[PDB]
Design a protein around this nucleic acid. Structure first.
Lengths: 187, 142, 258
RNA sequence: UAAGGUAGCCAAAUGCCUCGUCAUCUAAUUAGUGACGCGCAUGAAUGGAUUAACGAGAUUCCCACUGUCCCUAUCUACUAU
RNA sequence: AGAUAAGGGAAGUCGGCAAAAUAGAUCCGUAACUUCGGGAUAAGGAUUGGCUCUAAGGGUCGGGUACGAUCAACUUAGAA
RNA sequence: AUGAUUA
RNA sequence: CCCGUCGCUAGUACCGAUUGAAUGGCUUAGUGAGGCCUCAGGAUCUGCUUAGAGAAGGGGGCAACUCCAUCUCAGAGCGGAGAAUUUGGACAAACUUGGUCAUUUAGAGGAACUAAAAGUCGUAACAAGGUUUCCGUAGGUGAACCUGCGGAAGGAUCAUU
RNA sequence: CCGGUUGGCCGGUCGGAUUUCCAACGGGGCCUUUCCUUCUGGCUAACCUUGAGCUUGGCGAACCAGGACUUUUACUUUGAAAAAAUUAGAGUGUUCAAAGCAGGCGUAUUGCUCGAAUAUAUUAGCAUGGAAUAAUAGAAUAGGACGUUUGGUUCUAUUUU
RNA sequence: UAUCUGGUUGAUCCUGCCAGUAGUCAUAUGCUUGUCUCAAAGAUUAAGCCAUGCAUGUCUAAGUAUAAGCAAUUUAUACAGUGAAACUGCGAAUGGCUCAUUAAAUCAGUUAUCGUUUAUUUGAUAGUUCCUUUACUACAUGGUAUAACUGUGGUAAUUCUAGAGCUAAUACAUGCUUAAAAUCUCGACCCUUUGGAAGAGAUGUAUUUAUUAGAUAAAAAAUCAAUGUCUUCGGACUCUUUGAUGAUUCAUAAUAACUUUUCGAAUCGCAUGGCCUUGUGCUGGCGAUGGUUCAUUCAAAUUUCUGCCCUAUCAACUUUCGAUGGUAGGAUAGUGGCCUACCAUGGUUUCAACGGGUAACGGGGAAUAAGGGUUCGAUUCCGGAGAGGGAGCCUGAGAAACG
């Protein structure tokens, strides 16, 4: 099996170490996941000390946080559009960490309407008081508002789905948003 | 150390969410920590625009264990250098010593500017790479 | 070696148990417990090679299984349980109570005491933390885990316990000028009344320690064990009380009683 | 004898006897190669002894390949008719 | 005059004569010997299509006393 | 020019 | 006292045509088992939902007619587990072919070394050894060796105001 | 000046132990131009603090928590530490000895009790007192130390309003 | 117990070797051998091959028993005594053997885990699981085999196995059962506008992500966006709360969601006891088993500093196709070129890298001596490696396992 040790590598001086031991179980590795979208498959794997490890595959929906608001909703995933490690993961549509993807934007829009009462794109006393008090904070910036017009929002995956069975992440805002739109637009 | 966003990825300090809603002083935030053992986190690390998660001060690499001192001999690597540990091994039969050296490589932050010959002391941190275990914490030249 | 060890030969078992290098090529391995392997005295070697209350390990197992014996107020019917430092053992038959303390010659002593002096003990706090649900707690040198203590209790302090529960009767803080007991190293069994200490931030806090003949030395702060204030020990102490007189005075001593 | 072939080389495109003798290549080798040399008749600018590279030069063996062969058969165009 | 032949592979023959086999390009690898220049395409091995992409390689106009717009070649590498 | 072996 | 060629006997190692031979390690390339992981596969068993009839039984308009259970059989989906087989991948044994590194070993022949009670040819060295010896370099000759050029004294001179 | 070790009249005990002592030996402290880190604190310490000779108030490390400049080593002392067995070695009649860690003492009917020391352990790592020996940087086209000072730039920051 | 002697010469002094001499937990052999005590022993050449036979199985008071097994209950109508086989649960990864591999590798001393897994022990630790949560559902408790066995059997042989009929669980798959308060959301409604609100859903643990808190050298003034405590609305303003670390994004707490949903006892043995609302009503003891989290312990794995024999007739090595670093990701139990994508060209070297040999496992130690030292160390203890050479993998907390 895939080893994880350094008795098979070279030393730092440039010397092939000799074969001294056989491979172990406390030095192993395992194959990548190559996690995809649609028709949720989660195989679990027995690890060192019991301690199961839900190897994600084919994962359709995930959790996503909006950090300026501190909220976290379940959403679909359109697809990945940027990955720093490999454009191959972008093309072949394989979910991993740090992965820039697009999400439905409908729970955030409808939550915004229910929470602040302010339209996007294009009565009772209690809800009116709630929205009037929560005003002066519906002014986030141009890029996220435009993305809510489009109905497809850029998120960064911050989970490790092949290790957790959860594609979880957070919406991009401001600085890194501008950085990633610059990286995307380079033609 | 000219450009903080040199790499394709978005280098930042994890979990340090600079919130656009609150409008407080010092517009972007930066975590840090005193490494301990009587060392000082320099003002260049505080004021720095860099990230370097492998740095002991702003980063996440706790210094703990052995501490060593040596003179720098390499700088030709990216945020990593090599020093030389000159010491004297004793021979009882002949009852006298002999010079020996061990070229430990160490990691260095943008918080330090190190040229060759600059004696420096470092600290044992976790394995940074195949070759490295140590990280620079004090320099003793200019 | 492909998993945990289970056996123990003689000559890898420690010195201070004073087990003999003949009589079978195997030694009693301390099964896991509230004390370590080496700074622990198993009940088999206790009954069989300190008291001679039995002759063979089968007999010692017979005693432990028929439950004439009990440590810390509990039967503990395993033949290789670690009876460690400071601990209490109660025998209804003969109405004895042994206490496990050290002697200055570097051996596990046999401290005869009564039932009420058994019902309390001492324990050095090994560390302090915050448990789940915001419950501060501490853990001692005898695997005892205790919840909601006084905020004054910090590390290296000592607590005196009820033995019917794991709760606290009282505590003793750490500061300059307090009576102690040493447990670990060349200083095994000394009793030496803190004069000062030294920090060395980054590791290995050291402590200057001297017994009542003014005679000083230095030990690591994790090897010491504070037993109270100068003069009074909080417990009874064995013969000698940790002095370490010279080799020549003890030769002359034995030549005086012969 | 004018002086008697020195260094070197060889059954060499120079060696009659000769298919020289020994070894090797072979199942078998008047062939090939390495050695021996009283060399019928080798030999020093009538140039001797080597010699990388080069050769539509002469020779031997090995790998691949094949109607050259065992052992011939069939087909096409142009003839022959 | 041109071609192909099962099995074997120069047993044919004065003699591998004729014929076959090899063949471009890229990468790897390369002996004795030597006049040190070569031998060398030594020997020997691998890959090569179609299609959809990705990466790098440029020209000219622009800035108070880092970057944008616009125009056109095939070269090389890599992945499904 | 040379004077065999051993003592 | 002693040197070398040549001759006989025996041993030890070297060079040597033989693209020498065997043994072992490392290894390019090609084929590549077997488990493991992923794309499917679907025998097989099994739970649910109705599903109408060959017609008994009883309850009610007691006259046609109605209600449900029943041995029976399609038909449909809703699922659970699910082996043989299968695509792709990483681990990678083993074989074939080359290369390379070491360790032994055969060999026509060539050229050495050593040991041998009394082999042949000379007499080079030790006396000024009968041409003072020796050192380097070059040529010569059966063999020691001779000769040329420079050098030394370990010379046969510590010595010619 | 101080106090520790060694003896030393008188033995003032019948070979143990004492005072003032003639002498030596290293240790601790003060001064001689010799700061050989001080700010917050509580001990205010040694308290000029004195009540009649047992009283109310001197300068913080002599107790500590924190800041602070703490230029470097080699060396050496001491300690922590070096698993047992092994080696050296205390005590012990294995009947001696190799061994082993036991044994010994009673009113021998209740029982009692000393042991199982100590040392060595290369280099390397930790603390530690020293400052001889060997290097080691400091202040010279002064970006030099103390500065109660006096400004300006800068950020940090508790108490209140 | 810091020792010398014989041999070159006619003889002498020297250098220098040979030989003598003494020892060895250093082996082999010879010749001889009466006793007590202690005791090595197929390592060297072949880590060459192996017949036969053993070497790991296991229960209490206490997981499951109608043995169509054996005594007898007579305290027991379901057994309740003993008890093979079988299911289950543990262990079989320890021990024991050898020294072939391996020369910064193992190993020894010495650090770290602020970089991780850990059965078992040991100490603490799940009032919150009915999800239109009112008929949706047994909680004095719910469903399914299947072994052993019965009999039919099949192969020459195997610790070979099928077909058919039962039945069990701490085996599988499911599953409710106890308060009170406290904040968020909505939000009927009054409408108040100082604004009050009936009624409704959530909150335990665990996984995954994001955010906030997790602190605090010192003393006063001027106000506001809106008085905040109670009011003489002159403002007294105190009261206020956060632990450890050398040092952390530590412990820990709370918001917002994720989960195909983890754990929150349908288990077992003795003794059988009390309240009366006089009942198979309600409570009640000593235990065993297992279980989520944390600490501990026996471990495990990586890891800091220093140290290894002979060789330069081995002087350059590493990087094709990972060598050195960085960024990102995968994988891991976890850090880390451990592996992948892209990028920079680094890293080691006469202070002996790298390559070769080794009758090389390392060390604690053993022989020998005044001192210094030389040689050996497979071999009883510690750590490694292996099971004929290699490769792979299941079960498990723990194996790259060879009984």
């Amino acid at each position: 099996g895939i080893s994880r040790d350094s008795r098979h590598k070279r030393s730092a001086t440039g010397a092939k170490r000799a074969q001294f031991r056989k491979k172990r179980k406390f030095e192993l590795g395992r194959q990548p996941a190559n996690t995809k979208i649609g028709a949720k498959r989660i195989h679990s794997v027995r690890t060192r000390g019991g301690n199961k490890k839900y190897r994600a595959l084919r994962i359709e929906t995930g959790n996503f946080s909006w950090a300026s608001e501190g909220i976290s909703k379940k959403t679909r995933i359109a697809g990945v559009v940027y990955h720093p490690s490999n454009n191959e993961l972008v093309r072949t549509n394989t979910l991993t960490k740090a992965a820039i993807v697009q999400i439905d934007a409908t729970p955030f829009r409808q939550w915004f309407e229910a929470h602040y009462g302010q339209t996007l794109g294009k009565k009772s006393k209690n809800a009116e008081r709630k929205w009037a008090a929560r005003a002066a904070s519906a002014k986030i910036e141009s890029s996220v508002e435009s993305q809510f017009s489009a109905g497809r929002l850029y998120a960064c995956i911050s989970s490790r789905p092949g290790q957790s069975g959860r594609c979880d992440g957070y919406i991009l805002e401001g600085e890194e948003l501008a950085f990633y739109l610059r990286r995307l637009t380079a033609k | 150390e000219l450009t903080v966003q040199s790499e394709r990825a978005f280098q930042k300090q994890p979990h340090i969410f600079n919130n656009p809603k609150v409008k407080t002083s010092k517009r972007t935030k930066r975590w840090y920590k005193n490494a301990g053992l009587g060392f000082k986190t320099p003002k260049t690390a505080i004021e720095g625009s860099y990230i370097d998660k492998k740095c002991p001060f702003t980063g996440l690499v706790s210094i703990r264990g052995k501490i060593l001192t040596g003179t720098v001999v390499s700088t030709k690597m990216h945020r990593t250098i090599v020093i030389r540990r000159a010491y004297l091994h004793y021979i009882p039969k002949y009852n006298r010593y002999e010079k020996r050296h061990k070229n430990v490589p160490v990691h260095v932050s943008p918080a330090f500017r190190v040229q060759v010959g600059d004696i420096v002391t470092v600290g044992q941190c976790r394995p940074i790479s195949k070759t490295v275990r140590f990280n620079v914490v004090k320099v003793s030249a200019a | 070696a492909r998993g945990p060890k289970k056996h123990l030969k003689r000559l890898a078992a420690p010195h201070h148990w004073l087990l003999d290098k003949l009589s079978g090529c195997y030694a009693p391995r301390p099964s896991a417990g509230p004390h370590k392997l080496r700074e622990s005295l198993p009940l088999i070697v206790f009954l069989r090679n300190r008291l001679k209350y039995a002759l063979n390990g089968r007999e010692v197992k017979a005693i432990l299984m028929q439950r004439h014996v009990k440590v810390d107020g509990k039967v503990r019917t395993d033949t290789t349980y670690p009876a460690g430092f400071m601990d209490v053992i109660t025998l209804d038959a003969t109405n004895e109570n042994f206490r496990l303390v050290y002697d200055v010659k570097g051996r596990f002593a046999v401290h005869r005491i009564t039932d009420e002096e058994a019902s309390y003990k001492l324990g050095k706090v090994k560390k302090v933390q915050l448990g789940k649900k915001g419950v501060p707690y501490v853990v001692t040198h005898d695997g005892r885990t205790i919840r909601y203590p006084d905020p004054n209790i910090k590390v290296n302090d000592t607590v005196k316990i009820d033995l019917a529960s794991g709760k606290i009767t009282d505590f003793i803080k750490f500061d300059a000028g307090k009576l102690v007991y040493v447990t670990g190293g060349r200083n095994l069994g000394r009793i030496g009344t803190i004069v000062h200490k030294e920090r060395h931030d980054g590791g290995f806090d050291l402590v200057h320690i001297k017994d009542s003949l003014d005679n000083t030395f230095v030990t690591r702060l994790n090897n010491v064990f504070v037993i109270g204030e100068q003069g009074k020990p909080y417990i009874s102490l064995p013969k000698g009380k940790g002095i370490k007189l010279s080799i020549a005075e003890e030769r002359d001593r034995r030549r005086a009683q012969q």
